[PDB]
Amino acid sequence: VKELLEAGVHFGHERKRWNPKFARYIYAERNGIHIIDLQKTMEELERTFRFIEDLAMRGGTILFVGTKKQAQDIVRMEAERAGMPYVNQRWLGGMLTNFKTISQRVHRLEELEALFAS
RNA sequence: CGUCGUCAGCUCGUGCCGUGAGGUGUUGGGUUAAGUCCCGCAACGAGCGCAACCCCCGCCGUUAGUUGCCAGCGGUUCGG
Ligand SMILES: [Mg+2]
Ligand SMILES: [Mg+2]
Ligand SMILES: [Mg+2]
């Protein structure tokens, strides 16, 4: 019910542009495309999802980062529905390490939403 | 105080990179008088600069008329 759908379009990408440390999961090469194996894919999906199901109800927050044209609005839609923050548009330089500084930009957003209804 | 020159610049906080000096921000294309602004961006902002806030000169209005003008019967030293 997982790989029945994951075998839809959700596997098989970039030809001859490959980071070869990813070759654990890389299955074959047909029409140039490095097709990715689905078995280790789904077990690695469980390895992620066990951690997500732990640290998602432990008060832990997920930060959904996606910048390409392909993954913009389907990150923006599915990111706001668990309270989890996202970056739909260009994710800036140091939102995380410089978080205490970009908190000032969030507060300027709040003190500008004060100036909207003003 | 003159000067580079009213020239568009010089920086900082924090983050990143770099052993380090130091970058980055401030590069790039566009744009203006301008580091002016926006689009991308390891940058996000901020400070002094620029601009604007000041004043004159421009037009119009309100108030005010011992300057000002004939519109007015009309004096008339016959002259604002
Ligand atoms: Mg500096
Ligand atoms: Mg270091
Ligand atoms: Mg400036």
mmCIF file of C-alpha atoms (C1' of nucleotides) and ligand atoms in Angstrom:
data_model
loop_
_atom_site.group_PDB
_atom_site.id
_atom_site.type_symbol
_atom_site.label_atom_id
_atom_site.label_comp_id
_atom_site.label_asym_id
_atom_site.label_seq_id
_atom_site.Cartn_x
_atom_site.Cartn_y
_atom_site.Cartn_z
ATOM 1 C CA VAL A 1 0.000 0.000 0.000
ATOM 2 C CA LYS A 2 3.192 1.991 0.246
ATOM 3 C CA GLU A 3 5.394 0.733 -2.585
ATOM 4 C CA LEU A 4 2.283 0.071 -4.694
ATOM 5 C CA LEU A 5 2.120 3.867 -4.948
ATOM 6 C CA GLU A 6 5.830 4.616 -4.579
ATOM 7 C CA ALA A 7 6.358 2.676 -7.800
ATOM 8 C CA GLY A 8 4.170 5.248 -9.581
ATOM 9 C CA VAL A 9 6.495 8.096 -10.660
ATOM 10 C CA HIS A 10 8.166 8.396 -7.242
ATOM 11 C CA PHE A 11 11.409 6.588 -8.174
ATOM 12 C CA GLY A 12 13.971 6.908 -10.931
ATOM 13 C CA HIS A 13 15.812 10.148 -11.578
ATOM 14 C CA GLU A 14 18.915 12.061 -12.631
ATOM 15 C CA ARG A 15 21.079 10.482 -15.356
ATOM 16 C CA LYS A 16 24.915 10.620 -15.091
ATOM 17 C CA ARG A 17 24.864 13.416 -12.499
ATOM 18 C CA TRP A 18 25.150 11.248 -9.441
ATOM 19 C CA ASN A 19 26.845 11.558 -6.070
ATOM 20 C CA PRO A 20 28.323 8.051 -5.931
ATOM 21 C CA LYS A 21 28.082 7.726 -2.147
ATOM 22 C CA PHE A 22 24.351 7.310 -2.824
ATOM 23 C CA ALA A 23 25.092 4.010 -4.592
ATOM 24 C CA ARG A 24 23.767 1.986 -1.665
ATOM 25 C CA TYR A 25 20.230 2.526 -2.900
ATOM 26 C CA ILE A 26 20.888 2.898 -6.625
ATOM 27 C CA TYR A 27 19.488 -0.174 -8.331
ATOM 28 C CA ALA A 28 20.049 -0.077 -12.068
ATOM 29 C CA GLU A 29 20.549 2.113 -15.129
ATOM 30 C CA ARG A 30 17.968 2.015 -17.906
ATOM 31 C CA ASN A 31 17.370 4.773 -20.441
ATOM 32 C CA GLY A 32 20.271 6.472 -18.634
ATOM 33 C CA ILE A 33 18.133 7.012 -15.534
ATOM 34 C CA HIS A 34 19.545 5.628 -12.300
ATOM 35 C CA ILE A 35 16.508 3.716 -11.064
ATOM 36 C CA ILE A 36 16.436 3.423 -7.286
ATOM 37 C CA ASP A 37 15.599 0.213 -5.438
ATOM 38 C CA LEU A 38 12.275 0.285 -3.610
ATOM 39 C CA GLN A 39 12.892 -2.325 -0.889
ATOM 40 C CA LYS A 40 15.697 -0.499 0.886
ATOM 41 C CA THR A 41 13.718 2.657 0.068
ATOM 42 C CA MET A 42 10.690 1.502 2.068
ATOM 43 C CA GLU A 43 12.760 0.159 4.952
ATOM 44 C CA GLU A 44 14.572 3.487 5.083
ATOM 45 C CA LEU A 45 11.148 5.139 5.019
ATOM 46 C CA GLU A 46 10.381 3.199 8.189
ATOM 47 C CA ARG A 47 13.762 4.174 9.650
ATOM 48 C CA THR A 48 12.796 7.823 9.151
ATOM 49 C CA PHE A 49 9.172 7.444 10.169
ATOM 50 C CA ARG A 50 10.000 5.722 13.441
ATOM 51 C CA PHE A 51 12.055 8.794 14.359
ATOM 52 C CA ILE A 52 9.358 11.164 13.086
ATOM 53 C CA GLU A 53 6.691 9.366 15.100
ATOM 54 C CA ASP A 54 8.939 9.627 18.148
ATOM 55 C CA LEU A 55 10.187 13.223 17.891
ATOM 56 C CA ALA A 56 6.944 14.545 16.426
ATOM 57 C CA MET A 57 4.819 13.870 19.508
ATOM 58 C CA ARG A 58 7.688 14.573 21.915
ATOM 59 C CA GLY A 59 6.996 18.283 21.451
ATOM 60 C CA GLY A 60 9.494 18.230 18.607
ATOM 61 C CA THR A 61 9.111 20.441 15.573
ATOM 62 C CA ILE A 62 9.913 19.705 11.932
ATOM 63 C CA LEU A 63 11.193 22.423 9.607
ATOM 64 C CA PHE A 64 10.072 21.836 6.030
ATOM 65 C CA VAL A 65 12.667 23.165 3.592
ATOM 66 C CA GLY A 66 11.999 23.238 -0.115
ATOM 67 C CA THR A 67 13.192 25.726 -2.702
ATOM 68 C CA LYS A 68 12.813 24.324 -6.230
ATOM 69 C CA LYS A 69 9.947 25.072 -8.596
ATOM 70 C CA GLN A 70 8.907 21.418 -8.364
ATOM 71 C CA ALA A 71 8.428 21.354 -4.592
ATOM 72 C CA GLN A 72 7.269 24.832 -3.603
ATOM 73 C CA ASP A 73 3.542 24.862 -2.998
ATOM 74 C CA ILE A 74 3.264 21.168 -2.137
ATOM 75 C CA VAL A 75 5.620 21.953 0.722
ATOM 76 C CA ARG A 76 3.667 25.082 1.646
ATOM 77 C CA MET A 77 0.336 23.235 1.738
ATOM 78 C CA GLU A 78 1.412 20.153 3.661
ATOM 79 C CA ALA A 79 3.727 22.015 6.009
ATOM 80 C CA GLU A 80 1.277 24.283 7.813
ATOM 81 C CA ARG A 81 -1.070 21.467 8.820
ATOM 82 C CA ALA A 82 0.841 20.225 11.854
ATOM 83 C CA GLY A 83 2.021 23.587 13.183
ATOM 84 C CA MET A 84 5.394 22.910 11.642
ATOM 85 C CA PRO A 85 7.371 25.837 10.197
ATOM 86 C CA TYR A 86 8.481 25.879 6.593
ATOM 87 C CA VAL A 87 10.483 27.669 3.953
ATOM 88 C CA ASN A 88 8.519 27.661 0.701
ATOM 89 C CA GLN A 89 10.440 30.531 -0.908
ATOM 90 C CA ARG A 90 14.241 31.014 -0.874
ATOM 91 C CA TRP A 91 15.469 29.744 2.442
ATOM 92 C CA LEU A 92 17.902 32.384 3.589
ATOM 93 C CA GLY A 93 21.444 32.200 4.871
ATOM 94 C CA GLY A 94 21.434 31.064 8.442
ATOM 95 C CA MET A 95 17.857 30.861 9.513
ATOM 96 C CA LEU A 96 19.042 28.253 12.021
ATOM 97 C CA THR A 97 22.525 29.243 13.230
ATOM 98 C CA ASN A 98 21.591 32.924 13.106
ATOM 99 C CA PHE A 99 18.134 32.244 14.547
ATOM 100 C CA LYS A 100 18.525 34.760 17.382
ATOM 101 C CA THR A 101 19.082 37.431 14.714
ATOM 102 C CA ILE A 102 16.263 36.418 12.386
ATOM 103 C CA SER A 103 14.040 36.488 15.459
ATOM 104 C CA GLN A 104 14.353 40.264 15.027
ATOM 105 C CA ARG A 105 12.956 39.899 11.531
ATOM 106 C CA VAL A 106 10.082 37.809 12.877
ATOM 107 C CA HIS A 107 9.447 40.538 15.444
ATOM 108 C CA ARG A 108 9.532 43.161 12.728
ATOM 109 C CA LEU A 109 6.921 41.011 10.975
ATOM 110 C CA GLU A 110 4.828 41.048 14.165
ATOM 111 C CA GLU A 111 5.320 44.791 14.763
ATOM 112 C CA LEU A 112 4.398 45.333 11.115
ATOM 113 C CA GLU A 113 1.236 43.292 11.527
ATOM 114 C CA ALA A 114 0.536 45.717 14.322
ATOM 115 C CA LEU A 115 0.946 48.459 11.696
ATOM 116 C CA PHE A 116 -1.422 46.702 9.296
ATOM 117 C CA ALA A 117 -4.362 46.916 11.724
ATOM 118 C CA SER A 118 -3.381 50.358 12.939
ATOM 119 C "C1'" C B 1 38.573 75.147 8.467
ATOM 120 C "C1'" G B 2 40.213 74.026 3.338
ATOM 121 C "C1'" U B 3 40.803 69.647 0.803
ATOM 122 C "C1'" C B 4 39.828 64.431 -1.803
ATOM 123 C "C1'" G B 5 34.221 66.144 -2.808
ATOM 124 C "C1'" U B 6 27.960 66.627 -2.461
ATOM 125 C "C1'" C B 7 32.223 62.408 -4.286
ATOM 126 C "C1'" A B 8 28.771 57.342 -3.187
ATOM 127 C "C1'" G B 9 31.080 55.691 -0.053
ATOM 128 C "C1'" C B 10 32.975 53.888 5.012
ATOM 129 C "C1'" U B 11 31.516 50.366 8.423
ATOM 130 C "C1'" C B 12 29.382 47.428 12.391
ATOM 131 C "C1'" G B 13 26.266 43.420 15.088
ATOM 132 C "C1'" U B 14 25.207 38.384 14.272
ATOM 133 C "C1'" G B 15 25.900 34.068 10.987
ATOM 134 C "C1'" C B 16 28.916 31.571 7.325
ATOM 135 C "C1'" C B 17 33.715 30.670 4.777
ATOM 136 C "C1'" G B 18 38.943 30.922 5.236
ATOM 137 C "C1'" U B 19 44.751 28.126 9.609
ATOM 138 C "C1'" G B 20 45.005 33.422 8.998
ATOM 139 C "C1'" A B 21 45.232 38.443 7.023
ATOM 140 C "C1'" G B 22 40.379 38.897 5.411
ATOM 141 C "C1'" G B 23 36.131 38.110 2.669
ATOM 142 C "C1'" U B 24 30.679 37.637 2.679
ATOM 143 C "C1'" G B 25 26.849 41.465 3.734
ATOM 144 C "C1'" U B 26 28.391 45.908 -0.213
ATOM 145 C "C1'" U B 27 29.034 40.630 -5.543
ATOM 146 C "C1'" G B 28 25.753 39.930 -10.283
ATOM 147 C "C1'" G B 29 22.634 41.682 -14.091
ATOM 148 C "C1'" G B 30 18.735 46.404 -13.970
ATOM 149 C "C1'" U B 31 18.375 51.161 -12.154
ATOM 150 C "C1'" U B 32 18.942 56.209 -10.616
ATOM 151 C "C1'" A B 33 21.817 62.087 -8.686
ATOM 152 C "C1'" A B 34 23.149 58.308 -5.154
ATOM 153 C "C1'" G B 35 25.406 51.768 -1.442
ATOM 154 C "C1'" U B 36 18.477 54.637 -4.652
ATOM 155 C "C1'" C B 37 15.486 50.470 -5.134
ATOM 156 C "C1'" C B 38 13.853 45.900 -6.443
ATOM 157 C "C1'" C B 39 15.114 40.306 -8.484
ATOM 158 C "C1'" G B 40 18.381 36.570 -7.252
ATOM 159 C "C1'" C B 41 21.787 35.261 -3.784
ATOM 160 C "C1'" A B 42 25.535 32.784 3.174
ATOM 161 C "C1'" A B 43 23.648 36.063 4.315
ATOM 162 C "C1'" C B 44 19.859 38.758 7.729
ATOM 163 C "C1'" G B 45 19.712 43.476 9.473
ATOM 164 C "C1'" A B 46 21.549 47.972 11.375
ATOM 165 C "C1'" G B 47 24.872 52.843 11.929
ATOM 166 C "C1'" C B 48 27.227 57.284 9.715
ATOM 167 C "C1'" G B 49 26.673 58.872 4.391
ATOM 168 C "C1'" C B 50 22.693 59.683 0.042
ATOM 169 C "C1'" A B 51 17.543 61.166 -0.068
ATOM 170 C "C1'" A B 52 14.035 63.525 2.960
ATOM 171 C "C1'" C B 53 12.954 66.633 7.580
ATOM 172 C "C1'" C B 54 15.150 73.212 7.140
ATOM 173 C "C1'" C B 55 15.069 77.830 4.341
ATOM 174 C "C1'" C B 56 14.628 80.863 -0.064
ATOM 175 C "C1'" C B 57 12.514 81.270 -5.130
ATOM 176 C "C1'" G B 58 8.175 79.378 -7.941
ATOM 177 C "C1'" C B 59 1.652 78.949 -7.994
ATOM 178 C "C1'" C B 60 -2.833 79.060 -4.964
ATOM 179 C "C1'" G B 61 -5.608 79.941 -0.371
ATOM 180 C "C1'" U B 62 -6.849 81.992 5.171
ATOM 181 C "C1'" U B 63 -5.636 86.152 8.527
ATOM 182 C "C1'" A B 64 -4.025 91.041 8.518
ATOM 183 C "C1'" G B 65 -3.939 95.799 6.519
ATOM 184 C "C1'" U B 66 -0.810 104.109 8.457
ATOM 185 C "C1'" U B 67 2.770 99.922 1.641
ATOM 186 C "C1'" G B 68 -0.800 99.388 -2.032
ATOM 187 C "C1'" C B 69 -4.487 100.896 -6.178
ATOM 188 C "C1'" C B 70 -9.765 105.652 -9.685
ATOM 189 C "C1'" A B 71 -14.119 101.023 -8.838
ATOM 190 C "C1'" G B 72 -17.273 104.754 -6.980
ATOM 191 C "C1'" C B 73 -20.302 110.004 -6.851
ATOM 192 C "C1'" G B 74 -16.278 113.847 -5.848
ATOM 193 C "C1'" G B 75 -12.951 117.434 -3.939
ATOM 194 C "C1'" U B 76 -8.833 118.826 -6.086
ATOM 195 C "C1'" U B 77 -2.407 122.744 -2.664
ATOM 196 C "C1'" C B 78 -5.158 120.324 -8.902
ATOM 197 C "C1'" G B 79 -0.611 116.075 -6.314
ATOM 198 C "C1'" G B 80 -1.161 108.310 -4.245
HETATM 199 MG MG MG C 1 32.979 44.297 7.607
HETATM 200 MG MG MG C 2 37.066 28.544 12.243
HETATM 201 MG MG MG C 3 22.080 53.412 1.686
#
